[PDB]
Structure formats: structure tokens, C-alpha cells
């Protein structure tokens, strides 16, 4: 196999019924990449069209800043392996968990930054007649950058922090074309009412609606309901209680993103070109 | 002369270094220049290009030290009868010489031995090792022996040279300075093992002779003196780590061996209140493990006997005052003595309290305990207003002293009920001497027992606190009515809670309200209905104390009267002709009480009886006394109701028992509520512990109330094989 001859595992960073994910280094240059290993999907099974939709999404999209890069893929030894860039930061699911463990919460500017990258990414993806339909805190990835700063040891000594955090959208398995809609049943937590009734005319607004729910969850709210009265309450344009206070303009933005009517929710093009961020 | 390696002969440098080392060991005078020079020679001999000579130097130093130790041992062994002083003098210089030559030997120890570490030890440790190997151990069989006799003579009275003995003893500890696993085991094995046995054996013989020669009282002082002397001798001679041990070895031989002889005297010690011997006896028995319980038991028995005899022959007149004063003075006299002589040990306070609890609660084999009733009488006498009343602060101090005796009551339910009855009787007639004194006395009960004990008394006071405002409001409301005339009547009605207030009307006989004051009722109920939503008030005619009689006359006389006498007096005066039977039953009912009141009025000599018999008959006639004269224009007729009856005390005791039933049942139900499964003995113990604070319930009454609750079906029992008590909601 080419995986054992050219790639070297470094750490196992995923598990599940889908397969596994490993941190690898290739001998040719030595840059750190990530390898997804799984089985062959069955014929006439959901994972099959998920995989083909994902590979077509990578083929069409190409390369971009906010979308995790695809490099190569192959199937061998009853295993299917795909190659993407290594985002060292992690997923928001782990970040929110570790941040909540100490009863600490994100800063509002960080929330505005979250909105900036996610809106720009959704704008770029929808530019190519595509809808993600798989948006959630576990599908948003982080990448780190470092910048040194200087402080005078003698006499006065003041140090300032200046670091940039980059956010990327991944897991293009559920992506379907707006002209040819093939929607897979999404997670009940972040599933818009329109998708629940299979109304396949306002697909781009469903991801905008789920985006505000992801941001609210990142703000420090309780785990989202999976079904029932609280589910309907959230779907009725009502937002959950937040441990911290936030600006009223941002709250209005959240409400309008969680508006019932899909048309009355703003599109990504309006959101990206907003002075609020 | 470069620091780089060269070639040097061993013989000359070795000879010079050995001469310098010998001079240092002798504690002789060595010039500063040779001391400067020898370190350079040492450095030359340590590192070398051909081969280092550290191993040869170490062996030569060991040989020289061995020779010196052998010479010193031979010299000290040659002199007899002066071995100890020679040993001390030689060690005093050898320690300093070894320290100085180890300071000179810093390079070899720092580099060679620590790197290498045939065990290898530093020169400073090697010197002491050789000293203990060939100077101490071979002489040990002598060195300790004579040493101990120089201690034994100290017991005789002659003190030998302390410096030499202390130095010799400290030498054993100083030898083991470098040892870290057991720095004091060698000294312990060489000194403590034989010396402890020797001194313990000597003290037993000394104590036997001292006890045989002298009496117990002098024995005690002599033992204390010997202990004090040993406490100083140990500090003078022995190591600081052993000061306790030898002391213990004395106290287990001179006091512990004669314990019985002490205990047989204990009785005679503390039944005569001897402040001299007791203070030393207690101190010496504190060290003894099991000498204290005998003291506790005997003192408790003495206290109980004294307390019982203190109240055996007190006069019947002024019963409560003497009973309280004797207990208070006994408690004070004993507590001050115990705190002064016995250093205030808590066990003795506990024993005193235990004895006083039984002394206060002394009960005759067939009689009922009289403590709560006597204490209630004492409180009533102190609190009631009288012409011979005393100042308020003295009353407060007396109550504060009395609360101490009150704390010793075993069962406070009877006392609580008696206090409620007396306080109600006092406040109805306004016999209290101060309004704030009642609150001050109630606060003592509140802090002693809790809120549940005196909540009834708090609402008791609150009733009359609000009654004055209610009366003022009624007086204000009187003027509101357009056309209402009250004539002469001007009354206050005390609004009282039925359940909280203990007074009640056991016989339920209806009474006919006189027509002259009929409106007094109706206006009061209408005012109460207007002011209060749905409160229903019941009139008590047994405690009405309204004074009414003619005031304008040639010979006026006004007397306090009761409504029961008021009705019959009004009926008699309204009709100009006296009636015997038709008037008495036409105007009032409950003829027996009316006849009793009429007989009381005859005893007052207000109306003459025409029956000429001491017993009132149905046909007996009467006549108003036209020549009635009283020494006072205004007076009060003393009704027989003011005096209590032992039958009323019987019903009070029955009510207390019923309240005990109710409280026990509630506690039992709460106990099943706590846990479903209850064991028989466990349940009994839990009930006793829970209910002990308020009073002491008996097992039989607890079983009776448990069976009563069985009848209520809240408790289910399966079989009388394994004791289990299940609970049913």
C-alpha cells in the first residue's frame, strides 16, 4: 500500500463507525497532513452518496482559504483513504467543552470573528450553487498562527498580545446542489423547519439559520434540545438563555438570523458586507 | 611551579604531612606558614600524571590513627581508679584534633571518597569510627559501671563532678553524629538499658522503706519531693531525650505499686474536706492511669450524701425558699472548692452535676416528686406583688441564680403547666409587680429550653399586649355611633386565645345575663364582627370582676362583687319582697353554685338568714341587713375561687400525662417517618434519646402509646417472631 510506504502516522485523532483519522507526514517534503481512513461504502447506502457528494464538492470548489483543502484520495486493501490539510486548532466542539469546564466563556469579539469567517465561507460555497447542509460545531475547524512581540526587560516592561486565529469549514459530505437537491437527513439539533417538511426551495437560508444556533451554542448556552417542546420553541424564533450579557445589536442580528420566514433572514452576501463585524 | 602534573617523591612530603598531622592532633602550636604549605602538598599528592597516591595516603592516615587510638587506649587503661577523667580529658582534645585534621583533609574527602562512594568513609568519620572501635568498646565494660555509681551516690546526697560525667555521657552521642539510620541507638544500648533497671530497682527499695517508716500523709510529701529531686537530677546528668523515661520508671515503682494502699485511704481523704492532702493526692493520681475513677465515684457519693442531708430537715413553712437556697449554697460551696483545689477538672464537674441531678430529683418510694411544684411556688412568691416587695434588680439576680436549679429538673412538663396556671392566675387579677419582669423571666425559659417551651407564654403575653389597644379602639368606636348610650357601664374585655390559655370552664352551665347590662354584650359582638372577619367569642362568667353597688346613700358601702353574686343581688333588690325559690331559679340556673355563693354572702354578713340553720334549704328566707356596717367604705369580698384544690392538681397532672401521650405519639410517628425498619431495642433507645431533653418518659407508657398508634392503623406488624415495625402512610 502507498499509505505505509509514503505516510507516517503521528497521532490518532478520531474514531467512530465511519472510520478513523490520523496525523501523517509524507517523506517527499515532510509537511503535516491528515488522513481519513474508512471502509468501502455499500451500494445503495447513504454513505455512498455522501462520499460521492463530498468528492464532487472538493472537485468543484478547488482551493480556498476558508475551505479545508483536498490533496489526493485512493482506495486500496478494502480501505478508502482521503488526504486533507492538518488544522491544528481543533473543532469548536472540543474548544467549547474545555472552555465550559472552567465556567469560562468566549469574548464578544471572538464571536464577531466567528461570524466573519463562517459568513465568508458560506458566501463562497453558495457562490457555486451549493449548500453545506452539514453545519454544526463539530464541523468547524481551527488553525493557529503565532506572532512574536518585544518587551524591555530592564526598567519599564509592558507586553502586548497580537495573535491571529483562523477558522475553516469542512466535512463537505452532505453538500447538495441547489439546482439538483439531494438532501440527507440532518442533525435534529440544527435542522431548520423547512428541511423538516422537505421544502427544497429555500435551502441556502437553512444553513444561515443553523449558523446562529451554532454561534449561540458557542456563546455558552446549555446543550441544544434534540426534540420536543424546546425544539419547537427554538424553531419559533426564540433564543436560549445565555450565561453572559451581550450587545443588543448582535442580539438583534441573532434574532433576525433565527427569524421564521426564510426570505426575511438575511443572506450571506448581506452579512459579509456589514459594519457590525 | 605550575599546577600541571609533575613527579614528586612520596617519602619527604609524607613525612612532613605526618609531622603536621601529629602536631595538629596533639593540639600543639603549629605555625601559619606550614598550614599554608601543607594544602599545596595535598593537592600535589592528589592528582598526578604517573598515578595518584590517594589510596596510599588514605591507608597511611588510617594506620596512624589506629596507632594513636591504640596508644591512647593503652595509656588510659594503665591508670586505674581515674579512668573516667582521663577518658574525658583525652576525648576533649581528640575531638578538636580530628575536626582540625578533617578541615585540613578537605580535598581528599571532597573529591576522591565521594566520587568512589572495602567501604570508603571520610577522614572525620574514620577518626570517630576508630575511636569507637578501639577506645570505647573494649573499655565499655568498665566505663559505664563506675559511671552509674557516681550517679547512685547522688541519690545519697553527695554530688560528684558533673562536668566529667556529662562529657563522658555526651561522648557516646557525639560518636554517632555521622550515623543517620540510628544516631542514638548506640548511646541507648550503652546507657539506658542497665541504668533504667538499676534506678527502678533502687526506687522500689527506697519507696518500700519510706512507706514502712512514715505514714501515708508524710509518704505523699516525701514521694513528691523524690519526684521533684529526680526531675532535677535527670536534667543535670541525663540526655534531654530521656528526661521523661526515667521519670516514668519512678512513677511506676513508687506510686503504682502501692495503689491499693492509696485507694483504701482515698475515702478518709475526701470525706473530711482536707484541703492539704487532697491537692497532692489528686496530682499524684493524675499520673496513674486508673486512680482517677475511684476519686470520681467517692466524691460523687459524698456530694450526693451531702445534698440529700442538706434538704432532709428543712422547715415546712417557706418550703421553696429554703429548698432553693440550700441547693444553691451547696452547689457554690462544692464548685468553688473543686475549682480551687482540684484545678477544675471536667470529670469532677460532671460528677458533681450527676450527684446534684439525683439530689434535686429525690423522690419518696411511694410519693410523687415535689420539685416542680415547689419551684413554681417559689417563682410565684418571688414574682407576686406584695407590700413587702423587694427591688427589681435583686429579683432579676435571684431568678438568674434560680435558673441554675431549674436546669436540674428531670421533667419540666409539670413545671411548665404549673407555671402557665400560676402566671394566668396572676395576670388575670393583675398581681404582677412589674410588666418587664414577666418578659425577663420568660426569656430565661426561652434561652434555657427553646421556642417550643415558651411560645404559649409569648402568645399569652401578646394577648394582653393587644387587649389594651383593642379596648382603646372600642372606646374610640363608641363615639362613632349616632345614638348609642352606655349609661354607667365602662368595661374592658381581655381577648384571649382559647387553646393557648390554660383556664377553661369544666362545667358547662348556661347563665342568664342581667338586663341592666345586656347591651354590653351585643355592642361588643357587633364591634368585634365589624373589626374582625370571623372570630367567634365566648363569654366566661367565672372570672368577671366588675364592682357594682349603690354609691349615694346615708351609709354608703361599695364592695367588689362577682357576676354570679351580682345577678342574685340585683334580683333581690329589684323586688321589695324577698323570695326564697321562685326568684333564684327564675333569674338564674345552676342552683348548687348559687346556693354556695349565697352561703358565702351570708358569711360576709350582708344578708340575714331567716332559716336559723347553718345549711341553706329550698324554703329558707332572707332579709337585707339594714344595719350593715363595714370598717372600710370600699372593700373586696374574698371569694373561695382564689384558693386552689388538690383535685385541680390531679386534673392538671392528668392533662400533663395526656400532653405526654400526644408528644410521644408525634415523636414515634416521626421516628417511623425517618426510617421504615426499626429494631425493638434500637427503637426504644432512639425514643429515649430523642425525648430525653424535655423530660423522662417511661418504657410502659411508650409501649401503650405505640399500641394506641397500632389501633390507628398507621403501624403494621407482620409476626411476633422477629421484632420489626413497619410504617403505613
Amino acid at each position: 500500500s502507498r499509505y505505509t510506504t509514503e505516510f507516517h502516522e503521528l497521532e490518532k485523532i478520531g474514531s467512530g463507525e465511519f472510520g478513523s483519522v490520523f496525523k501523517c507526514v509524507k517523506r517527499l517534503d515532510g509537511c503535516i497532513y491528515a488522513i481519513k481512513r474508512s471502509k468501502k461504502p455499500l451500494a445503495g447506502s447513504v454513505d455512498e452518496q455522501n462520499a460521492l457528494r463530498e468528492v464532487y464538492a472538493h472537485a468543484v470548489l478547488g482551493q480556498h482559504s476558508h475551505v479545508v483543502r483536498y490533496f489526493s484520495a485512493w482506495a486500496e486493501d478494502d480501505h478508502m483513504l482521503i488526504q486533507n490539510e492538518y488544522c491544528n486548532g481543533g473543532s469548536l466542539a472540543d474548544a467549547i467543552s474545555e472552555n465550559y469546564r472552567i465556567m469560562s466563556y468566549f469574548k464578544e469579539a471572538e464571536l464577531k470573528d466567528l461570524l466573519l469567517q463562517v459568513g465568508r465561507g458560506l458566501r463562497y460555497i453558495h457562490s457555486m450553487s451549493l449548500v453545506h447542509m452539514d453545519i454544526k460545531p463539530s464541523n468547524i475547524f481551527i488553525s493557529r498562527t503565532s506572532i512574536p512581540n518585544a518587551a524591555s526587560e530592564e526598567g519599564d516592561e509592558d507586553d502586548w498580545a497580537s495573535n491571529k486565529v483562523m477558522f475553516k469549514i469542512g466535512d463537505l459530505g452532505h453538500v447538495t446542489r441547489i439546482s439538483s437537491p439531494q438532501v440527507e437527513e440532518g442533525d435534529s439539533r440544527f435542522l431548520a423547519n423547512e428541511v423538516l417538511q422537505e421544502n427544497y426551495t429555500h435551502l441556502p437560508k437553512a444553513d444561515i439559520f443553523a449558523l446562529a444556533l451554532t454561534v449561540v451554542c458557542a456563546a455558552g448556552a446549555e446543550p441544544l434540545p434534540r426534540n420536543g417542546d424546546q425544539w419547537h420553541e427554538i424553531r419559533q424564533g426564540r433564543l436560549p438563555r445565555i450565561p453572559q450579557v451581550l450587545s443588543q445589536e448582535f442580539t438583534e442580528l441573532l434574532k433576525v438570523m433565527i427569524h421564521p420566514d426564510p426570505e426575511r433572514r438575511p443572506s450571506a452576501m448581506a452579512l459579509v458586507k456589514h459594519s457590525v463585524l | 611551579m605550575s599546577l600541571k602534573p609533575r613527579v614528586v617523591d612520596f617519602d619527604e612530603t609524607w613525612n612532613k604531612l605526618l609531622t603536621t598531622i601529629k602536631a595538629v592532633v596533639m593540639l600543639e602550636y603549629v605555625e601559619r606558614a606550614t598550614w599554608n604549605d601543607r594544602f599545596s602538598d595535598i593537592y600535589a599528592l592528589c592528582v598526578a600524571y604517573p598515578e595518584p597516591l590517594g589510596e596510599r595516603l588514605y591507608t597511611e592516615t588510617k594506620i596512624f590513627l589506629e596507632n594513636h587510638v591504640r596508644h591512647l587506649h593503652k595509656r588510659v587503661l594503665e591508670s586505674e581508679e581515674q579512668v573516667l577523667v582521663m577518658y574525658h580529658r583525652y576525648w576533649e582534645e581528640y575531638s578538636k584534633g580530628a575536626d582540625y585534621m578533617d578541615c585540613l583533609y578537605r580535598y581528599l574527602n571532597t573529591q576522591f571518597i565521594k566520587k568512589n562512594k572495602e567501604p570508603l568513609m571520610e577522614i572525620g568519620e574514620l577518626a570517630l569510627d576508630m575511636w569507637r572501635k578501639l577506645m570505647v568498646e573494649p573499655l565499655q565494660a568498665i566505663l559505664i559501671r563506675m559511671l552509674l555509681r557516681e550517679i547512685k551516690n547522688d541519690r545519697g546526697g553527695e554530688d560528684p563532678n558533673q562536668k566529667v560525667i556529662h562529657g563522658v555521657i555526651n561522648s557516646f552521642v557525639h560518636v554517632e553524629q555521622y550515623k543517620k539510620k540510628f544516631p542514638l541507638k548506640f548511646y541507648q544500648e550503652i546507657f539506658e538499658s542497665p541504668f533504667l533497671t538499676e534506678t527502678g530497682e533502687y526506687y522500689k527499695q527506697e519507696a518500700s522503706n519510706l512507706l514502712q517508716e512514715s505514714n501515708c500523709s508524710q509518704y505523699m510529701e516525701k514521694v513528691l519531693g523524690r519526684l521533684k529531686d529526680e526531675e532535677i537530677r535527670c536534667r543535670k546528668y541525663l540526655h534531654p531525650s530521656s528526661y521523661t523515661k526515667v521519670i516514668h520508671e519512678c512513677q511506676q515503682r513508687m506510686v503504682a505499686d502501692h495503689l491499693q494502699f492509696l485507694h483504701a485511704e482515698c475515702h478518709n481523704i475526701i470525706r473530711q474536706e482536707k484541703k492539704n492532702d487532697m491537692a497532692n493526692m489528686y496530682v499524684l493520681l493524675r499520673a496513674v492511669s486508673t486512680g482517677l475513677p475511684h476519686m470520681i465515684q467517692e466524691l460523687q457519693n459524698h456530694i450526693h450524701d451531702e445534698g440529700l442531708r442538706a434538704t432532709s430537715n428543712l422547715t415546712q413553712e417557706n418550703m421553696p425558699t429554703l429548698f432553693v437556697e440550700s441547693v444553691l449554697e451547696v452547689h457554690g460551696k462544692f464548685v468553688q472548692l473543686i475549682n480551687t483545689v482540684l484545678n477544675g477538672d471536667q470529670h469532677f464537674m460532671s460528677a458533681l452535676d450527676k450527684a446534684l441531678t439525683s439530689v434535686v430529683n429525690y423522690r419518696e418510694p411511694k410519693s410523687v416528686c415535689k420539685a416542680p411544684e415547689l419551684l413554681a411556688k417559689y417563682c410565684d412568691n418571688l414574682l407576686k406583688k406584695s407590700a413587702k416587695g423587694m427591688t427589681e434588680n435583686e429579683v432579676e439576680d435571684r431568678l438568674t441564680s434560680f435558673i441554675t436549679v431549674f436546669k436540674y429538673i428531670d421533667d419540666k412538663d409539670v413545671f411548665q403547666k404549673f407555671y402557665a396556671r400560676m402566671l394566668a392566675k396572676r395576670l388575670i387579677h393583675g398581681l404582677s409587680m412589674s410588666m418587664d419582669s414577666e418578659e425577663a423571666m420568660i426569656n430565661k425559659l426561652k434561652q434555657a429550653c427553646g421556642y417550643e417551651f415558651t411560645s404559649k407564654l409569648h402568645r399569652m403575653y401578646t394577648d394582653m399586649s393587644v387587649s389594651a389597644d383593642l379596648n382603646n379602639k372600642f372606646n374610640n368606636f363608641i363615639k362613632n355611633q349616632d345614638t348609642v348610650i352606655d349609661l354607667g357601664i365602662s368595661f374592658q374585655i381581655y381577648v384571649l386565645q382559647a387553646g393557648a390559655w390554660p383556664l377553661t370552664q369544666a362545667p358547662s352551665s348556661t347563665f342568664a345575663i342581667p338586663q341592666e347590662l345586656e347591651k354590653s354584650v351585643q355592642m361588643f359582638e357587633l364591634f368585634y364582627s365589624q373589626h374582625f372577619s370571623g372570630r367567634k367569642l365566648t363569654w366566661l362568667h367565672y372570672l368577671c370582676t366588675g364592682e357594682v353597688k349603690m354609691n349615694y346613700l346615708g351609709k354608703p358601702y361599695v364592695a367588689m362583687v362577682t357576676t354570679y353574686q351580682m345577678a342574685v343581688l340585683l334580683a333581690f333588690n329589684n323586688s321589695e319582697t324577698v323570695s326564697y325559690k321562685e326568684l333564684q331559679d327564675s333569674t338564674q340556673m345552676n342552683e348548687k353554685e348559687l346556693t354556695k355563693t349565697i352561703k358565702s354572702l351570708l358569711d360576709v354578713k350582708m344578708i340575714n338568714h331567716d332559716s336559723e340553720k347553718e345549711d341553706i334549704d329550698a324554703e329558707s328566707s332572707f332579709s337585707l341587713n339594714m344595719n350593715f356596717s363595714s370598717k372600710r367604705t370600699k372593700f373586696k369580698i374574698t371569694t373561695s375561687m382564689q384558693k386552689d384544690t388538690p383535685q385541680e392538681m390531679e386534673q392538671t397532672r392528668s392533662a400533663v400525662d395526656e400532653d405526654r401521650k400526644m408528644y410521644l405519639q408525634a415523636a414515634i410517628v416521626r421516628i417511623m417517618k425517618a426510617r421504615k425498619v426499626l429494631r425493638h431495642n434500637a427503637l426504644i433507645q432512639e425514643v429515649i434519646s430523642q425525648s430525653r431533653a424535655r423530660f423522662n418518659p417511661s418504657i410502659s407508657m411508650i409501649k401503650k402509646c405505640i399500641e394506641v398508634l397500632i389501633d390507628k392503623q398507621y403501624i403494621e406488624r407482620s409476626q411476633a417472631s422477629a421484632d420489626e415495625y413497619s410504617y403505613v402512610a
Partner: protein, 155 residues
């Protein structure tokens, strides 16, 4: 069987600002949950870096070139603490005070090829000191020694 110098996993965030004060280039190392160190990028002298690390992790700071030990907060070993009121934890790096032998040993090590130590005219018994180079494992063992020493002197 876990070494005493082990860290503890807590998923507990902490914000630490590494500041370099020594003229020599520093190199942080972190002890993992197993007990072995892992390096990290070097910090140029006179530069600072705010970084995110979890609480309870053990940090050491060695030299990039010679691997001689350096003191962090005047201590060999550094461990973060929970952030209070939003102030990052400071972990300064400062030069120790070498005794005259090691400070003189470093220059000789720098100026002499490791194969030529036998050639220099010096006392024969001392190249045993110069031949050894500083390594992290020996310092770790010596650091673990005082743990058992302290537990011994505590009773």
C-alpha cells in the same frame, strides 16, 4: 508505575506569556502524560509569546545550543495556574549563577572539538568532568531525588 514528574490531563485552559531575558537562545520543553519531554520552537532573546496550554502540565526551559539549564521564575520547574480576572500567567526565563568551574567549562567545550579533549595539556583526572555534556534526563532524575528526600524528612 507512572513517574512522579508526570503531568495530569484536565482539559483546563490557561494563558501563559513566555518572556525571554537570557542572551542565550531558550528552548521550552513540556513533559507529557507518560513522563518524557517534547521540544518546541526556540524563542529569540528579548522576545515574548502568548500561548495556550492546559493546567497541570510541567514545563522546563533548556538552552538551544549547549543545553545548559536555565531558571524559570527562579525555579528549575514551572507549572501554570488558573487565570484569575483575565490576567495571563507570567513565566520569565533568566540566567542562573554558574559556579566558576561550569562557566569556565562551557567556553572550553565551545572552543575545542569533542574528539580533541585528550590532546590538551591539562590534569589527567579532570577530563572525566569535561567529557559529560548536559542532558535533560539526568536533571530529571536529580529533580525526582528531592521528592523522596522531602517525603523522608517529613517523618
Amino acid at each position: 508505575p507512572r513517574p512522579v514528574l508526570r503531568s495530569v490531563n484536565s482539559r483546563e485552559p490557561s494563558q501563559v506569556i513566555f518572556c525571554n531575558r537570557s542572551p542565550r537562545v531558550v528552548l521550552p520543553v513540556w513533559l507529557n502524560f507518560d513522563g518524557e519531554p517534547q521540544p518546541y520552537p526556540t524563542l529569540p532573546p528579548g522576545t515574548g509569546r502568548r500561548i495556550h496550554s492546559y493546567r497541570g502540565h510541567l514545563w522546563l526551559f533548556r538552552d538551544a545550543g549547549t543545553h545548559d539549564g536555565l531558571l524559570v521564575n527562579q525555579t528549575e520547574l514551572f507549572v501554570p495556574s488558573l487565570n484569575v480576572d483575565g490576567q495571563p500567567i507570567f513565566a520569565n526565563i533568566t540566567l542562573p549563577v554558574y559556579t566558576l568551574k561550569e562557566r569556565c567549562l562551557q567556553v572550553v567545550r565551545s572552543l575545542v572539538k569533542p574528539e580533541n579533549y585528550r590532546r590538551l595539556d591539562i590534569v589527567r583526572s579532570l577530563y572525566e568532568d569535561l567529557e559529560d555534556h548536559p542532558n535533560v534526563q539526568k536533571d530529571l532524575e536529580r529533580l525526582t531525588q528531592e521528592r523522596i528526600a522531602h517525603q523522608r524528612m517529613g517523618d
